[PDB]
UniProtKB/Swiss-Prot annotation, chain B:
Gene giving rise to this polypeptide: CHRNA4
UniProt source species: Homo sapiens (Human)
Source species, domain of life: Eukaryota
Disease: Epilepsy, nocturnal frontal lobe, 1: An autosomal dominant focal epilepsy characterized by nocturnal seizures with hyperkinetic automatisms and poorly organized stereotyped movements.
Protein name as annotated: Neuronal acetylcholine receptor subunit alpha-4
Family, as annotated: Belongs to the ligand-gated ion channel (TC 1.A.9) family. Acetylcholine receptor (TC 1.A.9.1) subfamily. Alpha-4/CHRNA4 sub-subfamily.
Subunit-structure text: Neuronal AChR is composed of two different types of subunits: alpha and beta. CHRNA4 forms heteropentameric neuronal acetylcholine receptors with CHRNB2 and CHRNB4, as well as CHRNA5 and CHRNB3 as accesory subunits. Found in two major stoichiometric forms, LS (low agonist sensitivity): (CHRNA4)3:(CHRNB2)2 and HS (high agonist sensitivity): (CHRNA4)2:(CHRNB2)3, the two stoichiometric forms differ in their unitary conductance, calcium permeability, ACh sensitivity and potentiation by divalent cation. Cells produce predominantly an (CHRNA4)3:(CHRNB2)2 nAChR.
Function field: Component of neuronal acetylcholine receptors (nAChRs) that function as pentameric, ligand-gated cation channels with high calcium permeability among other activities. nAChRs are excitatory neurotrasnmitter receptors formed by a collection of nAChR subunits known to mediate synaptic transmission in the nervous system and the neuromuscular junction. Each nAchR subunit confers differential attributes to channel properties, including activation, deactivation and desensitization kinetics, pH sensitivity, cation permeability, and binding to allosteric modulators.
Shown chain mapped onto the complete sequence: 328 to 577 of 627
Subcellular location as annotated: Synaptic cell membrane; Cell membrane
Swiss-Prot record, chain C:
Residues represented out of the complete protein: 297 to 350 of 502
Compartment list: Synaptic cell membrane; Cell membrane
Reported function: Component of neuronal acetylcholine receptors (nAChRs) that function as pentameric, ligand-gated cation channels with high calcium permeability among other activities. nAChRs are excitatory neurotrasnmitter receptors formed by a collection of nAChR subunits known to mediate synaptic transmission in the nervous system and the neuromuscular junction. Each nAchR subunit confers differential attributes to channel properties, including activation, deactivation and desensitization kinetics, pH sensitivity, cation permeability, and binding to allosteric modulators.
Gene this protein is translated from: CHRNB2
Annotated family: Belongs to the ligand-gated ion channel (TC 1.A.9) family. Acetylcholine receptor (TC 1.A.9.1) subfamily. Beta-2/CHRNB2 sub-subfamily.
Disease linked to the protein: Epilepsy, nocturnal frontal lobe, 3: An autosomal dominant focal epilepsy characterized by nocturnal seizures with hyperkinetic automatisms and poorly organized stereotyped movements.
Protein name, UniProt field: Neuronal acetylcholine receptor subunit beta-2
Assembly with partners or alone: Neuronal AChR is a heteropentamer composed of two different types of subunits: alpha and beta. CHRNB2/Beta-2 subunit can be combined to CHRNA2/alpha-2, CHRNA3/alpha-3 or CHRNA4/alpha-4, CHRNA5/alpha-5, CHRNA6/alpha-6 and CHRNB3/beta-3 to give rise to functional receptors. CHRNA2:CHRNB2 and CHRNA4:CHRNB2 nAChR complexes exist in two subtypes: LS (low agonist sensitivity) with a (CHRNA2/4)3:(CHRNB2)2 and HS (high agonist sensitivity) with a (CHRNA2/4)2:(CHRNB2)3 stoichiometry; the subtypes differ in their subunit binding interfaces which are involved in ligand binding.
Length: 38, 48, 54, 38, 38
């Protein structure tokens, strides 16, 4: 019941956190590449 | 130092580099190498 | 020889300034900076190709 | 039987732990922004 | 159906990945201790 809904919500939050982390890492790596080009 | 800080996000390793510097030169130097949402989240985590 | 040394010191001072700027650019993240679209189109598409960086 | 409950508890704990890490990272980044403003 | 098998496979892969990471980190700490002793 409530346990299943909590587990699903937690899994979803973990997924969203990981996607946000990937996005931030990608932007940081873009900045690194810009510095390398300069 | 430039070679050491290289990553797939900026460089590609040529095949000849890989072959030479991971097979021959290391050996010549006597140094040897050693619900739908939940399942979707789990798959994304594994792939990541 | 002194003229050459002067010229090279001017160049090296310029390089120090440029290295400060390059280091500042290197340590940028979304939490503090936003990349302008022109920065993208220039520095990730056009100039890299001119320099054979790929 | 108890295994499902243990798994639910573990998932909740993992989600809470990552929330805490996110909060700490946010505060650290705020301090970095303060230094850059100064 | 296939969703459950994929979920179990992904969880097992995550557990294996963390186990390997822990093993690597432990060996690194052993090397750090050796340097400290010297
Ligand atoms: C089942 C959720 C696993 C999350 C692992 C996150 C490691 C940084």
């Amino acid at each position: 019941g409530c346990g299943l809904r909590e587990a699903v919500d937690g899994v979803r939050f973990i997924a969203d956190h990981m996607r946000s982390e990937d996005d931030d890492q990608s932007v940081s790596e873009d900045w690194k590449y810009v510095a390398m080009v300069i | 130092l430039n070679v050491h800080h290289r990553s797939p996000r900026t460089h590609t390793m040529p095949t000849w580099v890989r072959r030479v510097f991971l097979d021959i030169v290391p050996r010549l130097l006597l140094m040897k190498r050693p619900l739908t949402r939940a399942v979707e989240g789990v798959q994304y985590i594994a792939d990541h | 020889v002194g003229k050459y040394l002067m010229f090279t010191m001017v160049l090296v001072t310029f390089s120090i300034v440029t290295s400060v700027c390059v280091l500042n650019v290197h340590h940028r993240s979304p939490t503090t900076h936003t990349m302008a679209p022109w920065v993208k189109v220039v520095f990730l598409e056009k100039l890299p190709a001119l320099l054979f960086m790929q």
